[PDB]
């Protein structure tokens with residue numbers, strides 16, 4: 283992997299692995315999400331980091347508020363995919379990281395993703411607007427003019443997501459993380475929540491459809507000893523409304539939507 | 546990745562990923578096991594496959610009977626590890642696949658692994674001895690003289706493993722696979738069983754010890770709608786454990802194993 287010529291974006295190539303593919307011999311959406319995370323980490327590392335100097339002193343961290351992924355073609359086992367990533371400041375609200383996925387042989391865009399990140403105190407878990415010192419430190423690594431993976435006006439990445447009402451049409455209950463689901467900081471990996479959301483989609487839909495779009499809002503983390511219920515209702519291609527909540531008290535942890543295309 | 550000069554083994558390099566590491570910022574044993582599987586798959590593909598022509602005609606497949614891994618140093622996040630793999634015939638019993646893990650910068654051996662594979666009919670699930678036709682078809686891809694990742698006389702990879710007796714000292718109950726745990730053939734990935742075994746090791750042991758050796762026997766697979774219980778009892782600067790995976794309902798054994806840990 284390497285920063286591009288202008289130093290304002292990062293590219294990396296990946297060979298799709300045998301255990302990274304599903305029953306159609308193409309990468310799953312969780313494999314795609316893991317590769318987006320990996321290229322994001324490699325970009326932060328290449329430019330000196332993604333906590334800045336000022337963030338470390340104030341005990342501030344970036345946390346994902348929303349993830350939006352659109353896949354046109356999933357790469358097959360053995361294929362090489364090239365992923366380009368970059369970040370942009372969104373004023374005092376937070377930051378955005380975008381990605382473009384391309385087939386390395388054809389050079390064609392096979393997917394795109396966007397994510398919204400907010401600043402949070404790592405100990406109290408309280409959100410905070412971005413100060414001048416934090417930006418400026420961050421802004422020299424971002425394009426200054428807007429660069430959007432999802433430019434279109436009224437695109438799917440900015441749609442408001444409603445709360446699923448009981449009863450759910452489908453469900454998968456009692457989902458619990460194992461050690462493989464944790465990151466190096468002993469927090470549940472963001473990609474695990476994508477898997478848990480997908481758990482309540484019926485197998486018949488997975489067997490006959492391909493996931494085209496997923497939008498996920500992150501409200502709260504699955505903490506030590508928490509158990510999750512995954513709920514889904516068809517709203518319609520087939521569209522679904524999703525809700526992840528704690529098994530016990532019903533506290534919301536995520537809400538999302540998926541759009542599927544018949545194979 | 547590429548076959549070596551003589552065409553009898555295969556090597557591949559991997560850069561350890563951010564999500565592949567644990568709290569120590571080094572690859573987990575499940576990441577190592579996934580990389581062993583990936584390099585094995587790439588070796589079978591490079592030589593024309595790992596079902597041979599005669600196996601596909603008779604609906605026969607290779608299945609893992611045992612996996613044995615020893616790690617001296619886990620590679621750190623961003624490090625490059627080089628893995629060499631090869632297969633050997635073990636007469637009519639089955640086949641063996643071995644691996645050697647090396648630090649790409651120093652060239653030093655940081656781990657080794659060995660696995661025993663048996664032939665089985667895909668449909669009935671019945672095991673069977675290796676015939677001459679099958680044996681001849683894969684012998685041209687194997688070294689003829691013995692080549693062992695674990696050569697030593699009384700090595701840990703060939704130890705008999707006893708069955709854990711109730712009550713277990715530790716347990717993790719109701720473990721169930723999600724779609725990410727399945728392979729392209731809709732079977733639970735062999736590496737998931739390694740994770741499930743490790744689930745019943747207490748967090749305090751994980752925090753203060755490093756896993757040095759794991760030996761796992763595969764007896765039966767976790768099938769559609771099956772739920773697993775993971776049981777562990779200490780048998781022992783080192784700590785040894787006895788492990789048992791069994792179905793939550795009837796208590797049917799799916800795996801048994803042992804782990805050896807050393808204090809950090």
Ligand SMILES: Cc1cccc(C(=O)N2CCC(C(N)=O)CC2)c1
Pocket residue numbers: 458459460461464468469470504505506507508717744745747748
């Ligand atoms: C640190 C953390 C953060 C969030 C959730 C968990 C948790 O509830 N686990 C994962 C690991 C655990 C184990 N010891 O196997 C079983 C359940 C742990």
Ligand SMILES: Cc1cccc(C(=O)N2CCC(C(N)=O)CC2)c1
Pocket residue numbers: 454481482484485721722723724727731732733767768769770771
């Ligand atoms: C095909 C197979 C083989 C072995 C076990 C399972 C199983 O029990 N699952 C995994 C996926 C499933 C789902 N539909 O989310 C929930 C439980 C499925």
